[PDB]
């Protein structure tokens, strides 16, 4: 209405502001944030790791990395077929296969990771078991 200035949500956090110069309403949104998780086999095995950025689209982390706008400074090797998108977040450092094995390291919504064969880290959709059919 022609007399308000701000926009307030249910929990009373501002989420819309009108520009004072020109009367235009702008929607605001917090900058991206979340946790960071590290997937590793034993240090007795090797020293390679994979990193999961939780609940973020892969393009945003790629852009922030390319413009050095991220807080934890790893800049893990990101070129090639190692950036994968999951419902849990952006997974960097493991390649996605289309086989199905038993779950080794749980990651997210039906995705696990393991150390296979040279050697590398892979991600796959977990297998519930061997299909069977009884002769009724």
């Amino acid at each position: 209405l022609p007399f308000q200035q701000f926009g307030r949500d249910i929990v009373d956090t501002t989420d819309a502001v009108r520009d004072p110069q020109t009367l235009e309403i702008l929607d605001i949104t917090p900058c991206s944030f979340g946790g960071v998780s590290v997937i590793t086999p034993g240090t007795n095995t090797s020293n390679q790791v994979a990193v999961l950025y939780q609940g973020v689209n892969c393009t945003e982390v790629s852009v922030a990395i390319h413009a050095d706008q991220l807080t934890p400074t790893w800049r893990v090797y990101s070129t090639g077929s190692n950036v994968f998108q999951t419902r849990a977040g952006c997974l960097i450092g493991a390649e996605y296969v289309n086989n199905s094995y038993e779950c080794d390291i749980p990651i997210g919504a039906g995705i696990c990771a393991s150390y296979q064969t040279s050697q590398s880290i892979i991600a796959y959709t977990m297998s519930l078991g061997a299909e069977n059919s009884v002769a009724y």
């Binding site: 929990v11 944030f33 939780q54 919504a109 299909e131 009884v134």
Partner: protein
């Protein structure tokens, strides 16, 4: 009366439901973001408080892992994924409402679809983590559990799965509650119709009643309400001059803003501790419920139970699982007697000065003739030495009635 008995002459097949919560939402919290948004001074002050933030993280991580353990325990009972035969003729019994439907993209039963449509329904450093098992995988587990118990009975829960036709399995299950086999073989069509109608009524009983899934609804509502309270607690003063760190620092002298910052820090830390303790207690309750659900899955779905009123009200026959959001639904099938009648009874029979007791049944009289019957379904027989034993002379027993026993 001391010489009168009642024996049923007809029965009934009934189906009831049971809803049990299994798991709740997994959340994680970041202390620095929640307490001290981006100010460096607040974080530096919070450093002189110890390990009050490692403990909250550890507690929430433990809750999150237990939430997946619960679902793994309830649903991953079986080891192999069983498939149902292409043809769906099972002696006249109809299972369409509970078996997966290929036309639906998600491969869910109609009743599972009804439940899914019925329940239904990033802050400041607060996140929500997805569960490890997607809904399709839980549906696949449920489908395997249903296919195993139709084509094999209860044998697949103790070793290799051995097939058997469905009417024979039902005959075994009648035999397991004290009713002979021939009752089912002589009332097959009627019993199948009763079962079909009982399954049919479930859709209406679930759909019309709104307050059926109150437990799952409350599970969702409490978790939403706690988070809303936690976020809206961020705008309280706790005795300070303002609720914004920037406005405190802008118009105050650095050795004087410490008091206000400390007050805000203490208030917010107390709020976090309250939230975590409440979460821990709720998690313990949910774990108890999930353990009960796992026991019911083992004992009512993979076998036949003799515990009274454990798998429904009546004499248990079998049960079927269905997957619901954050929980499970059980469909218990029981046997119920009906249409009783007066009778006169006696404890023993004297013949040639020899007492007689029935091997399996109770002596009964229709006013003129004496028979022997099984004590769950009226089916008189003729007294003979092939269904009685002697064991006694004629006189110690009280209320003995003498008649003729043939050979």
């Amino acid at each position: 009366s001391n010489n009168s008995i009642a024996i049923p002459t007809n029965f009934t097949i009934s189906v009831t439901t049971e809803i049990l919560p299994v798991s709740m939402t997994k959340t994680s919290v970041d202390c620095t973001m929640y307490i001290c948004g981006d100010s460096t001074e607040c974080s530096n002050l919070l450093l002189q408080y110890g390990s009050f933030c490692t403990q909250l993280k550890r507690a929430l991580t433990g809750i999150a892992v237990e939430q997946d353990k619960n679902t793994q325990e309830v649903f991953a009972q079986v080891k192999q994924i069983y498939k149902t035969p292409p043809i769906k003729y099972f002696g006249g019994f109809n299972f369409s409402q509970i078996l997966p439907d290929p036309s639906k993209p998600s491969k869910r039963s109609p009743i599972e679809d009804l439940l899914f449509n019925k329940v239904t329904l990033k802050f400041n450093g607060l996140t929500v983590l997805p569960p490890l098992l997607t809904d399709e995988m839980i549906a696949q587990y449920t489908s395997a559990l249903l296919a195993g118990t139709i084509t094999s009975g209860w044998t697949f829960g103790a070793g290799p799965a051995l097939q058997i036709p469905f009417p024979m399995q039902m005959a075994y299950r009648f035999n397991g509650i004290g009713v002979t086999q021939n009752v089912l073989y002589e009332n097959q069509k009627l019993i199948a119709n009763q079962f079909n109608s009982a399954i049919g009524k479930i859709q209406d009983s679930l759909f019309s009643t709104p307050s059926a899934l109150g437990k799952l609804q409350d599970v969702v509502n409490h978790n939403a309400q706690a988070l809303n309270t936690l976020v809206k607690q961020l705008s309280s003063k706790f005795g300070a001059i303002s609720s914004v760190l920037n406005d405190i620092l802008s118009r105050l002298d650095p050795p004087e803003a410490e008091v206000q910052i400390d007050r805000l820090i203490t208030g917010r830390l107390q709020s976090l501790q309250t939230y975590v303790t409440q979460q821990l207690i709720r998690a313990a309750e949910i774990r108890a419920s999930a353990n009960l659900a796992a026991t019911k899955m083992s004992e009512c779905v993979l076998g036949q139970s003799k515990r009274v009123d454990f798998c429904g009200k009546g004499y248990h026959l079998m049960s079927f699982p269905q997957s619901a959001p954050h929980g499970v639904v059980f469909l218990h099938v029981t046997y119920v007697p009906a249409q009783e009648k007066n009778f006169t009874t006696a404890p023993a029979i004297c013949h040639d000065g020899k007492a007689h007791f029935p091997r399996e049944g109770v002596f009964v009289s229709n006013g003129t003739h004496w028979f022997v019957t099984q004590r769950n379904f009226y089916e008189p027989q003729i007294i003979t030495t092939d269904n009685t034993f002697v064991s006694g002379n004629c006189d110690v027993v009280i209320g003995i009635v003498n008649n003729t026993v043939y050979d």
